[PDB]
Design a binder for this molecule. Structure first.
Ligand SMILES: Nc1ncnc2c1ncn2[C@@H]1O[C@H](COP(=O)(O)CP(=O)(O)OP(=O)(O)O)[C@@H](O)[C@H]1O
Ligand SMILES: Nc1ncnc2c1ncn2[C@@H]1O[C@H](COP(=O)(O)CP(=O)(O)OP(=O)(O)O)[C@@H](O)[C@H]1O
Ligand SMILES: [Co+2]
Ligand SMILES: [Co+2]
Ligand SMILES: [Co+2]
Ligand SMILES: [Co+2]
Ligand SMILES: [Co+2]
Ligand SMILES: [Co+2]
Ligand SMILES: [Co+2]
Ligand SMILES: [Co+2]
Ligand SMILES: [Co+2]
Ligand SMILES: [Co+2]
Lengths: 339, 343
């Protein structure tokens, strides 16, 4: 029956963000004896590795994802913004990159591949980051991403571990994209219906980085694959504190709520939920906890600041053209309290 | 009647035999990326096209490369270590020294298990330790077809980076590792061979190209690359095309595993060998038996360096190599006719 290209149908049904598990990940790595040196400032555990050389603080990160929209050009641009996000999350400036392309020449074709690259290039141009090469491998399930090298000007870098009790938790982009992507995959939604989320996914976190630094944030991370709760916990766990988050204060797309209540969501949201339930204190309905756990693609920065900094926050945000939402505060008890 | 309750896990059985023929040959991707408006800057010394990207910052010459491969053996630890040596190879091929890296892991938590994944990582870490390269992080994604590799950043001491573009007619072609691994890997995949039949090949795939880099720099090589996916003819051709010259390769001087020859003659070789042979068909001048051309076109994994040196360096090639403890084979010479002559 039934009276363009569909990339999503080439991804294994009912996904997440294709990642392979939360915290337990960086925990495996911890059990190994890794060669490191005097230049290694931050190794495994944060949004990016930090390495000093010739007096310069470089940051390095890599991220690859499966299709999140059916338009190849937009997938390329969004994946690029996603990879660059971790540089911004460290307070760094992207400098150069390499592309990692997994695609099957007969399950698609050069034309589609060229559109993904074009989207990536245009976003790198906007981020003034130079693509220096890459690698392409035959893969039935298409994936695209980048390894990125950046610099932290004047040697200042923001990790996930300096947060203090009594600080405000600030978020710069809404959550709920994973739900929308599941909606597109099932053919219930089209790109036009989620133009606002697409715009947020395409947006570079460079303006949020500036805002973040301007407010002298103590800790910072970006919200991606492990959901808002999982990424908030990384700050908590690394700073040895807790967080109280108010569901009512969290920005999300109305459509994400309508779909999630109809049990339409990526299986990844459930896995993220299950991982944090070991430190979660909440009596909210599950549709709320699934929404808060939902994998986010190219999400905003999540950081901590002092109330006192709220003085010129909206002014700063304005001139910078970046939104922000106060979603909660850090607490002494090492738990995640969602009210 | 006595079934092993213990699990098996054949990494090689999880690798797919693509039914799609390679459209991208030696240098094509570079030509393709030219039909794009790419943002670049004054610090970009070498962009898309060589073994690594070259970028200048306050006088420091950095090189960047990335490579990920599917399993080439069944041992997880060996696979991780080989993949690591393979990724570092491109930094060495530029004359650089690897500094730090990030790991890219594609694995299925249910068609394998954390324990095997830990073994891949352990092999990678031990090889990076040997390379004095710091692993700084990475990304892990769920994938039915296991894949593993690294993006690496290195530095070219004294600002000398060697490209595929500076060779000239009359120079000698030097290779530092045997070819033929693609055929051996195919034999392992078909259950014809076992790891124990290819210990020598495994040792070579595990070896870092650092000593070869020292030999290459000591002889002031004019051009260099490493032999990987496009086979010996294909990678030799990359130097030729970028240096606008041709090459004469003497099969009798080319190093390869005896088992690789026996296998090709019985048609046990990867389809990639036919695809690599097809890529160079319009520039190939040869009347050798075809098993020879197939072997010379066979995709190599974590291969050696391939570089050009002026004829007068021979006087010190041998003493320098013994000192450095690295093998080398003089397999040919560059020529004026932009053709690939295989004798
Ligand atoms: N295969 C691997 N090898 C080494 N380090 C790895 C790794 N996979 C992940 N890591 C590290 O383990 C931590 C968690 O990885 P990720 O979840 O990818 C962080 P992220 O990129 O900020 O989130 P995102 O993947 O949802 O975008 C990071 O420090 C990451 O660098
Ligand atoms: N997806 C991509 N985006 C940008 N550049 C890419 C790319 N894929 C490959 N390239 C570049 O195109 C040229 C050929 O790629 P490769 O064949 O991967 C070089 P190599 O790593 O030396 O060979 P190998 O892959 O057999 O190990 C290189 O300059 C590579 O950096
Ligand atoms: Co991150
Ligand atoms: Co990262
Ligand atoms: Co990330
Ligand atoms: Co490559
Ligand atoms: Co950070
Ligand atoms: Co190479
Ligand atoms: Co490379
Ligand atoms: Co390579
Ligand atoms: Co990641
Ligand atoms: Co080179």
């Amino acid at each position: 029956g039934g009276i363009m290209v569909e990339l999503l149908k080439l991804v294994r049904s009912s996904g997440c963000a294709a990642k392979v598990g939360p915290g337990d990940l960086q925990e495996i790595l911890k059990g190994f004896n890794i060669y490191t040196d005097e230049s290694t400032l931050v190794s495994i555990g944060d949004d990016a590795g930090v390495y000093e050389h010739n007096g310069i603080i470089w940051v390095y990160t890599v991220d690859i994802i499966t299709p999140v929209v059916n338009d190849p050009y937009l997938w390329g641009a969004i994946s690029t913004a996603n990879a660059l996000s971790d540089v911004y999350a460290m307070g760094g400036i992207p400098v150069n990159a390499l592309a990692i392309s997994c695609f099957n020449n007969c399950e698609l074709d050069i034309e589609i591949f060229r559109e993904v690259i074009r989207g990536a290039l245009d976003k790198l141009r906007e981020a003034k980051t130079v693509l220096l090469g890459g690698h392409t491998i035959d893969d039935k399930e298409p994936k695209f991403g980048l390894s990125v090298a950046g610099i932290c000007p004047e040697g200042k870098y923001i990790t996930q571990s300096g947060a203090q009790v009594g600080q405000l938790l600030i978020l710069t982009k809404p959550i709920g994209t994973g739900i929308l992507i599941k909606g597109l995959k099932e053919g219930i939604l089209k790109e036009e219906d989620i133009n606002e989320a697409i715009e947020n996914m395409l947006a570079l976190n460079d303006k949020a980085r500036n805002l973040m630094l301007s407010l002298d944030a103590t800790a910072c991370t970006d919200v991606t694959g492990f959901g808002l709760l999982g990424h908030a916990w990384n700050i908590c766990k690394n700073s040895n504190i807790g967080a109280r988050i108010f569901f009512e204060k969290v920005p999300y797309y109305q459509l994400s709520e309508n779909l999630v209540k109809k049990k339409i969501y990526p299986k990844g949201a459930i896995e993220n939920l299950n991982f944090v339930k070991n430190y979660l204190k909440s009596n909210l309905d599950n549709w709320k906890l699934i929404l808060l756990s939902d994998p986010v693609t190219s999400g905003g920065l999540l950081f901590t600041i002092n109330k006192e900094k709220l003085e010129k926050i909206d002014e700063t945000a304005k001139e910078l053209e970046v939104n922000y939402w106060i979603i909660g505060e850090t607490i002494a008890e090492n738990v995640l309290e969602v009210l």
